[PDB]
């Protein structure tokens, strides 16, 4: 008798698709063809942060736009002073397979996680002068792919167990669990208002969650392969996903559907990291073709290229003030661009 | 807070990083792969938590063995983390012929994985003492699962082991033939498979890994120095 509700779900998905199509009056290209092109964007490597041993899987900027934490698969977090390339802290990790790192918006804590299935929280502002593990968030049955601080006591982690979990750092338990994805949730992006976040999973779907009620608001299924990167548009009304389809896609939360596709026939390799500029006009996208690609977020044009890395570009972060873009890679170097 | 005292701190951190690069370079990282029926865990003890790490030393050389556990069935994403690893220790249950076919498919995906194209595989055909009994008795044979076993005969390499039934040799070298066939027909010369015969208790396994990792690094050096 489950076939009846299976057909119900099929007709429901058809209803969603038809509603999305009926709301599709004009593409983003048709509306922004009449605006000035961004033009040739040329960033150059202002800083090169050296010191990581193995490949770099993740970076996160501090909210001060000067400090950045970097995660290396040698089992080390390094806090960098990007202005002076000074290593502020070198945090040795219990597990050598960290796949994500986060900076608390207050700057007091840094989170990391990876194949150990644990979101380790490190307190940078100890009175003893050493960075020590404030908490270890166990409870995920898969590898941790992303973590993002909401406050100094809340953090949402995405895991390879097809589940996103909201955590309480003081308690150490999952306040909420998001269980909609059918594949490894690879990326995670917090909305600027922090009330929502989006997830990208290997099931090619992107889901929008409410961090409070634990409800998946919307589901987006534009891609064809695993979504490796996700980032919110600066106003929180849209997000961009980068997949193994060698394609970046822009989705609108209110339109509930895809806006643009950022693909080039010359590129056939998956996107590892994705980010926006401060105004959201530039869509930076890391690739395993060893180089990042600057995109025109409104016209889907390749505005520029960041080609300073000698291995797969794994992480990518634009400062909160929008001054620079840092780009870590599997060659163990971060690069600050401007 | 002087900047000159922060650069001194950053230089002291670099000094800690450089002496941690010495240990990282001198250590050898290994990835254990294999199914539940394969004696992967028994090898570990004879030499939620999502990764298990075993550190063993052979001839003053540090080996870091990374048994992966408490993950999902799909591994196309976290296997990228193990690129630029010294070797992959693949362990196979050679006795269970029904699950043996899935071991070749598991081995096939590892060998042709885009991120493990430069990583050699140290194959450990485990529980070969159980494999001898399963073919000496003759109750269950390989032809029931592999039709090409009847047309297979022992090659010039004829089991220089002290004493074993020729059917044991024919069967156990047929399992190698299936596994070596994948590593040769479906791969380049960038990485080499290293088949081995392993029992439930075999203290020689750490030496086999050391010898085979010595050859894997040897061919890295033969390519680093362009002597090839």
């Amino acid at each position, epitope marked *: 008798e489950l076939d009846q509700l299976r057909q119900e779900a099929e007709q429901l998905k058809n209803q969603i698709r038809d509603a999305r199509k009926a709301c599709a009056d004009a593409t983003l290209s048709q509306i922004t063809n009449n605006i000035d092109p961004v033009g040739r964007i040329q960033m150059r490597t202002r800083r090169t942060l050296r010191g990581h041993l193995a490949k770099i899987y993740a970076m996160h900027w501090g909210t001060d736009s000067r*400090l950045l934490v970097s995660a290396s698969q040698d089992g080390k977090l390094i806090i960098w002073d990007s202005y002076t390339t000074n290593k502020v802290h070198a945090i040795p990790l219990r597990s050598s397979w960290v796949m994500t790192c986060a900076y608390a918006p207050s700057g007091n804590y840094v989170a990391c996680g990876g194949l150990d299935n644990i979101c380790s929280i490190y307190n940078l*502002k100890t009175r003893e002068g050493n960075v020590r593990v404030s908490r270890e968030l166990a409870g995920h049955t898969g590898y941790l792919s992303c973590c993002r601080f909401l406050d100094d006591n809340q953090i949402v982690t995405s895991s390879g167990d097809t589940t996103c979990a909201l955590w309480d750092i003081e308690t150490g338990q999952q306040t909420t669990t998001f269980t909609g994805h059918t594949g490894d949730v690879m990326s995670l992006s917090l909305a600027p208002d922090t009330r929502l976040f989006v997830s990208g999973a290997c099931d090619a779907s992107a889901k929008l969650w409410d961090v409070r009620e634990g409800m998946c608001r919307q589901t987006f299924t534009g891609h064809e392969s695993d979504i490796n990167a996700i980032c919110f548009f600066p106003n929180g009304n849209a997000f961009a996903t980068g997949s193994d389809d060698a394609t970046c896609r822009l989705f609108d939360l209110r339109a509930d559907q895809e806006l643009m596709t950022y693909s080039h026939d010359n590129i056939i390799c998956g996107i590892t990291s994705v980010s926006f500029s401060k105004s959201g006009r530039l869509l930076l996208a890391g690739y395993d073709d060893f180089n990042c690609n600057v995109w025109d977020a409104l016209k889907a044009d390749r505005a520029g290229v960041l080609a300073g890395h000698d291995n797969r570009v794994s992480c990518l972060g634009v400062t909160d003030d929008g001054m620079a873009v840092a780009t870590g890679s599997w060659d163990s170097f971060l690069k600050i661009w401007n | *807070a002087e900047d000159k005292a922060a650069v001194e701190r950053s230089k002291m951190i670099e000094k800690q990083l450089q002496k941690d690069k010495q240990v990282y370079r001198r250590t050898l990282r290994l990835l254990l792969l294999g199914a539940d029926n394969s004696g992967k865990s028994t090898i570990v003890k004879q030499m939620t938590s999502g990764i298990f790490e075993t550190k063993f030393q052979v001839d003053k050389v540090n080996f870091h063995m990374f048994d992966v556990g408490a993950q999902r069935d799909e591994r196309r994403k976290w296997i990228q983390c193990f690129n630029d690893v010294t070797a992959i220790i693949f362990v196979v249950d050679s006795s269970d012929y029904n699950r043996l076919q899935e071991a070749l498919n598991d081995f096939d995906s590892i060998w042709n994985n885009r991120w493990l194209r430069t990583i050699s595989v140290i194959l450990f055909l485990n529980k070969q003492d159980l494999l001898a009994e399963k073919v000496l008795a003759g109750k269950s044979k390989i032809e029931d699962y592999f039709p090409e076993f009847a047309r297979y005969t022992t090659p010039e390499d004829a089991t220089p082991e002290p004493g074993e039934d020729p059917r044991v040799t024919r069967a156990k070298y047929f399992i190698r033939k299936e596994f070596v066939d994948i590593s040769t027909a479906s791969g380049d010369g960038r990485h080499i498979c290293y088949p081995h015969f392993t029992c439930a208790v075999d203290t020689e396994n750490a030496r086999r890994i050391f010898n085979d990792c010595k050859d894997i690094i040897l061919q890295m050096n033969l390519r680093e120095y362009n002597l090839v």
Partner: single-chain antibody
Amino acid sequence: VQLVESGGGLVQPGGSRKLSCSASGFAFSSFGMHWVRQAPEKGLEWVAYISSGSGTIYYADTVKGRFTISRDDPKNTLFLQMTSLRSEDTAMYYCVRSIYYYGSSPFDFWGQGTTLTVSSDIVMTQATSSVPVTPGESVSISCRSSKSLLHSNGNTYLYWFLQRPGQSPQLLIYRMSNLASGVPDRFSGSGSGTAFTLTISRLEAEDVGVYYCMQHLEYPLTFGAGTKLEL
């Protein structure tokens, strides 16, 4: 966090003594360590400095070549050797915990102080020397420097301290605008490059003490005379 200094007592001028500070409760190896003496009924005076890892070592001009600030990280003990003591060296020798990175707060913890009794530089001037006042009403303390403490970085290397009677100085404001840890938000530092003002919003019974200022722009570090606050 705890710094305890040993050594002192009556010393003849034609002799010598060695001061030691045992550190406990923090990663002593990762902290630069300062010696700051305080002559009886006088202001603080910076004596010596040793960086983390026993690298950069500095001395005061009045003491260079005579004292030796040694450090033994494994025992978490800081030393200070004195070769030929003088009557001017009579002071309570504080030992200060200081760490330097972006956003750091050096001079944040001071030792309880050991007493030794013997039988150019950026001059910091605190024009006011005593501000008698009642609790409740805001109090402002001002100081001036010989040259601008506003570095090209964008931060003003000015540090405010408070030595309550019968106690050790404690950090209130670091880099002229940053409240220290455990300090109430009543205190507030201001200034542009040469004139600095510390504004206590609602002075309480614990604010009675001497409020020193110190520059960290260049060595030697120089303290002001300190403005006492009567009650």
